[PDB]
Amino acid sequence: VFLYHIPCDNCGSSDGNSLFSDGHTFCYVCEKWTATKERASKRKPSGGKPGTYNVWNFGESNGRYSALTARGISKETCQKAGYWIAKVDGVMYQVADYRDQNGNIVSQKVRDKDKNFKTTGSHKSDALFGKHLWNGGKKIVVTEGEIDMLTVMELQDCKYPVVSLGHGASAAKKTCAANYEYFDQFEQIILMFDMDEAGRKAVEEAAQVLPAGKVRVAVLPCKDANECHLNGHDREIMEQVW
Numbered sequence: 538v539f540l541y542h543i544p545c546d547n548c549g550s551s552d553g554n555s556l557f558s559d560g561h562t563f564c565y566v567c568e569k570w571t572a573t574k575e576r577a578s579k580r581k582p583s584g585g586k587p588g589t590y591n592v593w594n595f596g597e598s599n600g601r602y603s604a605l606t607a608r609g610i611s612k613e614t615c616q617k618a619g620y621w622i623a624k625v626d627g628v629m630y631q632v633a634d635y636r637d638q639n640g641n642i643v644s645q646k647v648r649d650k651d652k653n654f655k656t657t658g659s660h661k662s663d664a665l666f667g668k669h670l671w672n673g674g675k676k677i678v679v680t681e682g683e684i685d686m687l688t689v690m691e692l693q694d695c696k697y698p699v700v701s702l703g704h705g706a707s708a709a710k711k712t713c714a715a716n717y718e719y720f721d722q723f724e725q726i727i728l729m730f731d732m733d734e735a736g737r738k739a740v741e742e743a744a745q746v747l748p749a750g751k752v753r754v755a756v757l758p759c760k761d762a763n764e765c766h767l768n769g770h771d772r773e774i775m776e777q778v779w
């Protein structure tokens with residue numbers, strides 16, 4: 538992209554040479570096009586949708602990777618999925634770091650005791666908690682919420698593909714749709730969404746936009762994976778996870 542004019546080191550004009558992102562320039566005068574690469578960087582936009590919250594920094598939020606005892610998830614799991622705790626305004630928050638291919642936090646999903654959702658960074662359509670952890674494979678389990686994603690991980694010793702959905706059950710169709718490209722590196726996709734009216738509707742939807750023939754639907758004797766996990770039903774979670 539065009540950054541701004543620059544004097545030409547060739548023909549010797551003054552402002553007839555334009556500088557782009559590339560790092561390349563073009564001189565209208567002499568008509569030369571060479572591919573400053575530094576200057577160009579120092580001008581790359583970034584940031585996200587105005588109004589949205591800034592990604593919370595672990596080292597500046599009192600963040601610690603504690604274990605969710607009342608959920609059955611350990612620190613070790615939390616630490617691998619990128620799920621941490623923050624103490625702000627004396628209050629407590631749980632943070633789900635949605636990272637990109639290069640482990641760069643892109644967005645975060647923050648919730649508190651009363652269970653109030655808050656977003657940060659650029660929580661795009663393809664938001665998939667855990668996504669950055671698996672380069673394809675045999676199977677991939679897709680829970681509904683980060684904590685369900687977390688549960689399957691506990692039970693599997695964090696050794697196999699599990700991701701969550703960015704904007705809950707509703708976006709189910711769009712998130713999976715938005716992630717069709719991704720989800721197709723695995724031979725299977727275990728849609729393990731909530732075990733209720735709303736959740737069951739989401740599965741209906743997701744299944745639709747997802748790659749035909751690879752889907753699969755989990756059936757838990759509880760509300761959701763963690764619900765089971767807090768009721769010895771790990772058996773049925775494992776039973777449907779392989």
Ligand SMILES: [Mg+2]
Nearest residue numbers: 681706731736
């Ligand atoms: Mg739900």
Ligand SMILES: [Mg+2]
Nearest residue numbers: 684761763764
């Ligand atoms: Mg739950």
Ligand SMILES: [Zn+2]
Nearest residue numbers: 545548564567
């Ligand atoms: Zn020139």
